[PDB]
Ligand binder design. Structure first.
Ligand SMILES: *[C@@H]1O[C@H](CO)[C@@H](O)[C@H](O)[C@H]1NC(C)=O
Ligand SMILES: *[C@@H]1O[C@H](CO)[C@@H](O)[C@H](O)[C@H]1NC(C)=O
Ligand SMILES: *[C@@H]1O[C@H](CO)[C@@H](O)[C@H](O)[C@H]1NC(C)=O
Ligand SMILES: *[C@@H]1O[C@H](CO)[C@@H](O)[C@H](O)[C@H]1NC(C)=O
Ligand SMILES: *[C@@H]1O[C@H](CO)[C@@H](O)[C@H](O)[C@H]1NC(C)=O
Ligand SMILES: *[C@@H]1O[C@H](CO)[C@@H](O)[C@H](O)[C@H]1NC(C)=O
Ligand SMILES: [Ca+2]
Ligand SMILES: [Ca+2]
Ligand SMILES: [Ca+2]
Ligand SMILES: [Ca+2]
Lengths: 280, 572
């Protein structure tokens, strides 16, 4: 398994491979394209992955999407691997979780104007830095904690602090938000990571591919801190339905694909069964 | 010509013989000249747009639209094709079908393969003998000549198990299931503008099990609806009188359209609003903003959706006071049907006169920077984008005591004591000022009289007094000493509650209507000793919550402040 950084390392160590890589990069960014394709289908850049929380993930993804030829699903460039009161108490007794926790809270709970509720990009940056370098027995315990009443569900909803990040003035079109997320490098890669690990299945007994709860939970929580950042819909104790901040309105004749894209978050038996079995 | 769906589904096994019929396809025409041809893509696609090999086992009948097996299968070909999946488990392959990969120009067909061979007729449940896993969902245009779009039977199932008695059945509906041929057809041409959805229950019957399966039908739209007024409204009268800001929604109207087809990507490129020209003042001071919204309307007890476009009219700059005009604006609407709108706009000027004499007083015990009175236009809370500044002109030019600064929120000026000694003199006891109300953009101005009486006595303060009111902590030391901002000469004490972290925190202020107001005005922000609990940029010791730009929004207990160190304390 060769990641794209070392694939560029072996690419820059050779003359023909670097020539065909820069040739295809000048093609994308007939006959010049097809020869570069039939050469670089044997490159170490061909089928290179990236890692979660690796150093210079952005360059790895910019290299990986550079060789990609120009669509509901895409290939993931990654390695295919009171209760909530007690979760917060287990965080605040460790030192690494406490510092970054107070970091994203003291950033995201700063009202600026009576119009601007909070700063968006710094709050997303703090949430990404929280959900990258914290051990996952702390994140999953605070974000997924089994509740029986309304106050526990409200604490669990308020954990990613949706008053700044999740909600907006309007609910835009889900397809437009998908286009915005697929414009950016990082959000498109996290969305493909979520699509590769959290589809429904008719063959496996838990409707999840490879019967892997862990990959679908990591593909869920890796979408926090982007524009396609989901959260719960209400403070329901047992009813657990996640959703991004959009809706099916404004769809036109593209209504069915919008509904099918939204049913990945609203009506996934794989993700809901994974959350329920993790709560058990 | 268009494909009825975009995904057909089929289950495969090992060692199925050649000539085995796999499935049917359907491609409904649009004009009475169109014959559905069917050509196949020359690659067995794997997963995530990956070619494996050219198709060499599945052939097609273009007339009946019959996908069937050209050759047989084995373990060797499938274990060969599973290698080129590049680290992924072989679960489903798919083919591309052209007709003359996206709907309706192309259709991809799925194949879910099993490494085991074909199981027995009795070893399969009738639910897996009637319908596939993927329940269908169809795409049908409006107002087109109908035909046949679906067939029920599973062809390798009855090809390999013909002895199982299986029937299919549909339940003023245009759809029908034919006898002796299980194709589904539609009687008349349909429209979404009557009804958009048709969900049905199809019944399979075996020997013995009766299986019900949902059957959704979706109708698509064309641009068959010109823009329409809600009820006769073609014009909108509006008056630009007081706001005159860079951007304020002047006029607003709705336009109905049952056409949905120009969706949000191409919605700008089709629904066109055009301000008709004629005056450059309109083109420098006006524009038309436009956006639709989907609403749900009833047709025959159903709920379909349509577009309600909203046209609003927006200013472009700060209109000055000297505008005394009126216009009529004409708007073209293109639903690519041609609609016209009008707007009677009337921009009326503003009078800026004031009441002539502001008779008022001031106590002698007051200190520096203490609020007294308010100078304002007759319409205080009408100005939005017009800057109005206030000044003073002392008559004798020897008894300068007071000043006026202007808050741009209310665009109004507040009296403040500037000097103590001139108020302290018994000579300058009744003072006459010319309050001149000026302007910035257009130099129309006015003036007025200010009579003020220096009234009362003077008493010295205590020996250990600080300079601000908020230094005191108890109640008695607050009122027995005088700070800076109060016009009473003594500091005032407001007393809160024991309800935890509240806005009602007990404190010592200059004025109980000005200092813990929650707003840092122009008077308090001059020198930071007046009201530290509304205007500081510092640190707070105690359970609290700070203000939104600055200040103490809520505290606990008693709250005092040292403005010399920008520090505050809150404690019961
Ligand atoms: C569209 O109409 C709905 C009706 O409830 C309303 O909630 C929504 O705010 C409207 N959106 C716009 C952009 O007018
Ligand atoms: C505006 O113009 C009209 C034109 O007749 C005039 O009567 C009116 O006095 C003008 N407005 C002001 C404030 O002078
Ligand atoms: C509306 O737009 C179409 C598309 O360009 C154009 O052909 C048509 O002439 C326009 N309508 C008018 C009244 O100009
Ligand atoms: C707008 O002005 C025209 C000009 O004569 C007039 O006919 C029309 O009645 C006005 N609109 C309204 C709503 O009065
Ligand atoms: C319009 O007036 C407001 C009032 O303060 C001012 O802040 C703004 O800069 C002005 N803008 C223009 C374009 O004149
Ligand atoms: C207040 O008095 C000082 C000193 O006499 C002077 O500089 C200042 O301009 C006065 N304030 C106003 C608003 O004129
Ligand atoms: Ca129609
Ligand atoms: Ca229309
Ligand atoms: Ca229509
Ligand atoms: Ca104040």
């Amino acid at each position: 398994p060769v990641d794209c950084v070392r694939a560029n390392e072996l690419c820059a160590a050779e003359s023909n491979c670097s020539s065909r890589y820069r040739t295809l990069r000048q093609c994308l960014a007939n006959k010049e394209c097809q020869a570069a394709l039939e050469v670089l289908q044997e490159s170490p850049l061909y089928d290179c992955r990236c890692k979660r929380g690796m150093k210079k993930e952005l360059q790895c993804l910019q290299i990986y999407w550079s060789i990609h030829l120009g669509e509901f699903y895409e290939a993931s460039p990654y390695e295919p691997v009171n209760h909530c009161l007690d979760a917060a108490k287990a965080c605040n007794l460790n030192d690494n979780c406490k510092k970054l926790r107070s970091s994203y809270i003291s950033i995201c709970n700063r009202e600026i104007s009576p119009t601007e509720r909070c700063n968006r990009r710094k709050c997303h940056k703090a949430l990404r830095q929280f959900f990258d370098r914290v051990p996952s027995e702390y994140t999953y315990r605070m974000l997924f904690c089994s509740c029986q009443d309304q106050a526990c569900a409200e604490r669990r909803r308020q954990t990613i602090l949706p008053s700044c990040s999740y909600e907006d003035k309007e609910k835009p079109n889900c397809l437009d938000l998908r286009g915005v997320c697929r414009t950016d490098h990082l959000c498109r890669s996290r969305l493909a990571d979520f699509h590769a690990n959290c589809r429904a299945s008719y063959q496996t007994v838990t409707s999840c591919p490879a019967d892997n709860y862990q990959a679908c939970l990591g593909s869920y929580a890796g979408m926090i801190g982007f524009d396609m950042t989901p959260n719960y819909v209400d403070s329901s104790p047992t009813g657990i339905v996640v959703s991004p901040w959009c809706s099916c309105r404004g769809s036109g004749n593209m209504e069915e694909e919008c509904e099918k894209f939204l049913r990945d978050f609203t009506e996934n038996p794989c993700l809901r069964n994974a959350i329920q079995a993790f709560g058990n | 010509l268009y494909f009825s769906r975009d995904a057909y589904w089929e289950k495969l096994y090992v060692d199925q013989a050649a000539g085995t019929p796999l499935l049917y396809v359907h491609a409904l025409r649009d004009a009475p000249e169109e014959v559905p041809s069917f050509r196949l893509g020359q690659h067995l696609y794997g997963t995530y747009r990956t070619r494996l090999h050219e198709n060499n086992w599945i052939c097609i009948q273009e007339d009946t639209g019959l996908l069937y097996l050209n050759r047989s299968l084995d373990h060797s070909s499938w274990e060969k094709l599973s290698v080129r999946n590049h680290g992924f488990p072989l679960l489903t392959v798919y083919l591309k079908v052209f007709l003359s990969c996206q709907w309706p120009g192309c259709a991809r067909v799925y194949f879910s393969f099993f490494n085991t061979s074909f199981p027995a007729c009795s070893s399969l449940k009738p639910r897996e003998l009637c319908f596939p896993e993927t329940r269908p969902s169809f795409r049908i245009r409006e107002n087109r000549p109908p035909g046949t779009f679906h067939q029920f039977r599973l062809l390798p199932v009855q090809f390999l198990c013909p002895n199982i008695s299986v029937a299919y059945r549909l339940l003023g509906l245009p759809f029908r299931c034919a006898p002796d041929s299980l194709e589904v057809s539609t009687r008349w041409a349909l429209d979404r503008e009557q009804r958009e959805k048709y969900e049905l229950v199809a019944v399979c019957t075996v020997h013995e099990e009766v299986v019900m399966v949902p059957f959704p039908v979706t109708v698509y739209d064309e641009d068959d609806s010109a823009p329409t007024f809600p009820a006769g409204v073609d014009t909108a009268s509006a008056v630009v009188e007081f706001k005159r800001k860079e951007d304020t929604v002047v006029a607003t109207l709705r336009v109905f359209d049952a056409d949905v087809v120009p969706a949000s990507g191409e919605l700008v490129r089709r629904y066109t609003s055009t301000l008709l020209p004629g005056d450059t003042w309109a083109q420098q001071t006006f524009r038309v903003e436009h956006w639709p919204n989907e609403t749900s309307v009833q047709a025959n007890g159903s709920f379909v959706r349509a577009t309600v476009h909203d046209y609003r009219l927006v200013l472009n700059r700060n209109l000055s006071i000297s505008e005394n005009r009126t216009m009529q604006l004409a708007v073209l609407v293109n639903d690519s049907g041609v609609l016209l709108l009008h707007f009677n706009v009337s921009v009326l000027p503003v009078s800026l006169h004031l009441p002539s004499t502001y008779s008022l007083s001031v106590s002698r015990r007051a200190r520096r920077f203490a609020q007294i009175g308010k100078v304002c236009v007759e319409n205080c809370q009408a100005f939005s984008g017009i800057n109005v500044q206030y000044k003073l002109h002392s008559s004798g030019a020897n008894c300068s005591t007071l000043g006026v600064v202007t808050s741009a929120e209310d665009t109004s000026g507040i009296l403040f004591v500037n000097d103590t000694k001139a108020l302290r003199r018994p000579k300058c006891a009744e003072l006459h000022y010319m309050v001149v109300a000026t302007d910035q953009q257009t130099s129309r101005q006015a003036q007025a009289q200010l009579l003020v009486t220096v009234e009362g006595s003077y008493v010295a303060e205590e020996a250990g007094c600080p300079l601000s009111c908020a230094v005191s902590k108890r109640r008695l030391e607050c009122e027995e000493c005088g700070g800076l901002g109060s016009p009473t000469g003594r500091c005032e004490w407001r007393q809160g509650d024991g309800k935890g972290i509240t806005r009602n925190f007990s404190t010592c202020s200059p004025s109980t209507k000005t200092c813990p107001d929650g707003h840092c005005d122009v008077v308090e922000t001059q020198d930071i000793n007046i009201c530290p609990q509304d205007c500081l940029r510092g640190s707070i010791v105690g359970g609290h919550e700070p203000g939104e730009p600055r200040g103490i929004k809520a505290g606990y207990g008693t709250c005092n402040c040292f403005p010399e160190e920008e520090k505050c304390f809150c404690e019961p």
